[PDB]
Design a protein around this ligand. Structure first.
Ligand code: ZSM
Ligand code: ZSM
Length: 330
């Protein structure tokens, strides 16, 4: 089997991407944030504290004839931005782009933090990291991908995120029309539960490539590209007037600037992030200071190849017995 679903930016800045997901019988369609940096499928629901729901579509398990309460199971998770959510667990039928899993753990939120409430466009998360990170207790649950894998034509999924445009998540096949050139595969460590890999270096604009190992994670659930301070300083030094702002929380730059590209290495291959992809727009409405899309990972404890990087590529998440990642230009 295979599945194929379109993923759409939530706003004009590509702050996150949502993908429609069918849950239950009859189907209830929710728009979820597919997150290769976590491993829980959780949804706003009829159980969510009423004051914490503001415009999201909810899952109502009592209206699904295939929903079953997973007795005694609870979950609780935190995200890189300090947001969090928690609740109880059902199993139900979940379909993505025509691919169906029965018995998928659907984590129903009883509580969500304010940043989830305030974002009406995201109805929950669909985790695609390794199932060892799943938070359900006392019996850990498998991700949608893990549950689907045995049925898939090939044990892979692919991320093809758009820049200010829709893109695609495919399960079970590699669309050879969706990329240029070849896919370069690279080793993954699963020891932290992430799609963790080592980039072979970087270049800024038309500058020379610096060969240096950069360990980090392929994370569709993080918006920006977080890299070591040395790398990020080298990038922003090429932008007149750019500075690191302690009060804003990162590098900012004049909105009048034209940004240079940023290249990262995948083995001997090179993925080029166009400069425009690094512009995250005014720091506050009406400002002429703009927020940068490449930020320091110092203090986060890991480098993160988030959407800024991934959207410049066609990315294969190969979930064979020894997982690997693939990257192609597009
Ligand atoms: N694990 C560590 N000690 S590094 C801290 C860290 C790890 C992962 C993320 C992204 S989580 C996500 N995409 N839901 C953010 C921060
Ligand atoms: N806690 C605060 N000082 S402001 C909290 C807050 C953030 C964002 C908005 C606009 S998005 C919306 N209304 N859903 C409204 C309130």
């Amino acid at each position: 089997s295979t599945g194929s679903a379109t993923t759409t930016p939530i706003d004009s800045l590509d702050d996150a991407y949502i993908t429609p997901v069918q849950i239950g019988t009859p189907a209830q369609t929710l728009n979820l944030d597919f997150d290769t940096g976590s491993s829980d499928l959780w949804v706003f629901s009829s159980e969510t504290t009423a004051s914490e729901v503001d415009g999201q579509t909810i899952y109502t398990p009592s209206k699904s004839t295939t929903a079953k309460l997973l007795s005694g199971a609870t979950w609780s998770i935190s995200y890189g931005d300090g947001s969090s959510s928690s609740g109880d667990v059902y199993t139900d039928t979940v379909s993505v782009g025509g691919l169906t899993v029965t018995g998928q753990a659907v984590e129903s939120a009883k509580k969500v933090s304010s940043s989830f409430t305030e974002d009406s466009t995201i109805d929950g998360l669909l985790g695609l990291a390794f199932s060892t990170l799943n938070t359900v207790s006392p019996t850990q649950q498998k991700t949608f991908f893990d549950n689907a894998k045995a049925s898939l034509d090939s044990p892979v999924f692919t991320a093809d995120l758009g820049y200010h445009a829709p893109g695609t998540y495919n399960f079970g096949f590699i669309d050879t029309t969706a990329y240029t050139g070849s896919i370069t595969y690279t080793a993954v460590s699963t020891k932290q539960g992430f799609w963790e890999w080592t980039s072979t270096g970087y270049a800024v604009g038309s500058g020379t490539f610096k060969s240096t190992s950069i360990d980090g994670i392929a994370d569709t659930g993080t918006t920006l590209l977080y890299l070591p301070a040395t790398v990020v300083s080298a990038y922003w030094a090429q932008v007149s007037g750019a500075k690191s702002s302690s009060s804003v929380g990162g590098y900012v730059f004049p909105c009048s600037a034209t940004l240079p590209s940023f290249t990262f290495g995948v083995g001997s291959a090179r993925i080029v992030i166009p400069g425009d992809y690094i512009d995250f727009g005014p720091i506050s409405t009406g400002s002429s200071s703009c927020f940068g899309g490449i930020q320091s990972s110092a203090g986060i404890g890991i480098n993160i190849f988030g959407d800024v990087a991934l959207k410049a590529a066609f990315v294969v998440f190969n979930g064979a017995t020894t997982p690997t990642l693939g990257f192609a230009s597009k």
